[PDB]
């Protein structure tokens, strides 16, 4: 197969700017790459047939460029409805193949730190003979960020699940999750349980911690 | 307006098959030629099948080959695709789609997993002891998606987050929803977190005390 290689992962710009997202074909493709667009729990739109042929009910914000292997997608003046992930593709031979995405996010006003805060097991689920320590942190950008868990100062790892909010479209923040999850008889051999988050906005890396019994 | 409407996904077990169905409607069927696609959670699309429009040359991908079949009755309006021996990398949203010498409908989800329908347990989550508090619940242990949390039946929006579950190594979903309120509402306001699992019928409302 060919591989298509869209750079760059994510990408943050503001109502307004102008920007072009690259797609690279690993081999020859010709003049049949499109381009299409997704927001989350929709279908991808196609905004582009072939190179920069526009397809109708796309505005002529959108352009297409490049020829053969290297290929890009600008959109003049964005707009809040173009704010999704967009993905090339190429119909040259099979199999069909599709870039690795580039989400366009909203380029965030200014940088904002999260709220941390730590979740102890609930009584009633250490009944159930399983613990699960949280660890939230709450409306930050940009959205790279760091939560690491540390269980008597041991650092953990394979141990926990993370999850992520969608950007927020009102003050563009984002919003993690950090889920520990033990059993009853381990959760139950160690004491201080805390949760070490890195955020740009935070000048140093913030720990918030809770021992057993104190809850 | 040009349209496809896909069908027969669910949830199933691994090596048993399910066939999807695809309706096309606003254009000639007979002529022009259609394709499968599918997305697995959080992945890049993925094409997997292409046929002609009379249903002579057919191409499948390396990963689907030897199971998965396409077919299409011209009669009838519809494109099939019949997948045998499903494996939990095949777990994906399957889309529709036309070609020309393009139009991707919404789609139908296949879930396959040997874990069975269960509802979910809710748990408090409270913070152990500054200006803004957080409080939730825990929706863990559940299966299969999705599961709708609301606070304080619809009346609590603001601050609220909900965020997108996780699938868990026992095959089994689970998710937080958070809400972050004034410190010192604590005490006159209540928080209660209203959780749906229309698959187990399961209705819960649980209110966290902080």
């Known amino acids: 197969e060919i591989v298509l290689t869209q750079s760059p992962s994510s990408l943050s710009a503001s109502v307004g700017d102008r920007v072009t997202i690259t797609c690279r074909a690993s081999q020859g493709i010709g003049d049949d790459l499109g381009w299409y667009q997704q927001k989350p729990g929709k279908a991808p739109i196609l905004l582009i047939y072939?190179?920069?042929t526009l397809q109708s009910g796309v505005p002529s914000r959108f352009s297409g460029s490049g020829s053969g292997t290297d290929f890009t997608l600008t959109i003049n003046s964005l707009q809040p409805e173009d704010f999704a992930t967009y993905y090339c593709?190429?119909?040259?031979?099979?199999?069909?193949?599709f870039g690795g995405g580039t989400r366009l996010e909203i380029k965030g006003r200014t940088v904002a730190a999260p709220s941390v805060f730590i979740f102890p097991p609930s009584d009633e689920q250490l009944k159930s003979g399983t613990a699960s320590v949280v660890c939230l942190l709450n409306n930050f950008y940009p959205r790279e960020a760091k939560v690491q868990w540390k269980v008597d100062n041991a650092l953990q790892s394979g141990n926990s699940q993370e999850s992520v909010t969608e950007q927020d479209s009102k003050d563009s923040t984002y919003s993690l999750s950090s889920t520990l999850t033990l059993s009853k008889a381990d959760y139950e051999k160690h004491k201080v349980y805390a949760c070490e988050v890195t955020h740009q906005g935070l000048s140093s890396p913030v720990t918030k911690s809770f021992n057993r019994g104190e809850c | 307006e040009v349209q496809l409407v896909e069908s027969g996904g669910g949830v199933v077990q691994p090596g048993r098959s399910l066939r999807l169905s695809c309706a096309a409607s606003?254009?000639?069927?007979?002529?022009?030629?259609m394709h499968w696609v599918r997305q697995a959670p959080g992945k890049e699309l993925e094409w997997v099948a292409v046929?002609?429009?009379?249903?002579?040359?057919?191409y499948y991908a390396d990963s689907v080959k030897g199971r998965f079949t396409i077919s299409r009755d011209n009669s009838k309006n519809t494109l099939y695709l019949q997948m045998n021996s499903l494996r939990a990398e095949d777990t994906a949203v399957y889309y529709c789609?036309?070609?020309?010498?393009?139009?991707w409908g919404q789609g139908t989800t296949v879930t396959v997993s040997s874990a069975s329908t269960k509802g979910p347990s809710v748990f408090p989550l409270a913070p152990c002891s500054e200006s803004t508090a957080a409080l939730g619940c825990l929706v863990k242990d559940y299966f299969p998606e999705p599961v709708t949390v609301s606070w304080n039946s619809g009346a609590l929006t603001s601050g609220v987050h909900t965020f997108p579950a996780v699938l868990q190594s026992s095959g089994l979903y689970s998710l937080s929803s958070v809400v972050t309120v004034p410190s010192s509402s604590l005490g006159t306001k209540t928080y209660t977190c209203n959780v749906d699992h229309k698959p187990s019928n399961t209705k819960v409302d649980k209110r966290v005390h902080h």
């Open positions: 046929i002609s429009y009379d249903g002579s040359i057919k």
């Open positions: 593709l190429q119909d040259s031979n099979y199999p069909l193949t």
């Open positions: 606003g254009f000639t069927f007979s002529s022009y030629g």
């Open positions: 789609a036309r070609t020309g010498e393009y139009s």
């Open positions: 072939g190179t920069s």
